[PDB]
Structure formats: C-alpha cells, structure tokens
C-alpha cells in the first residue's frame, strides 16, 4: 500500500489524497 500522511493507507493503482471534508483515502488515477 502507498503512504503520504502518517496513519491512513492507500490501496494499489491509486494516490494518496485528501476530501473536501478533511478525509484522508487514495484516489483511482489515470
């Protein structure tokens, strides 16, 4: 799994990202 923050994780095939409600999770990019 990727990193970025600290705590939260990120899956495969995806990058690291925060949502607009301060939600750390990994985005599907392409």
């Given at each position: 799994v990727?990193?970025?923050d600290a705590?939260?994780?990120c899956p495969d095939?995806?990058?690291c990202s925060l949502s607009p409600?301060?939600?750390w999770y990994?985005?599907?990019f392409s």
């Open positions: 990727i990193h970025c705590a939260t994780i095939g995806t990058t409600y301060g939600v990994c985005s599907p």
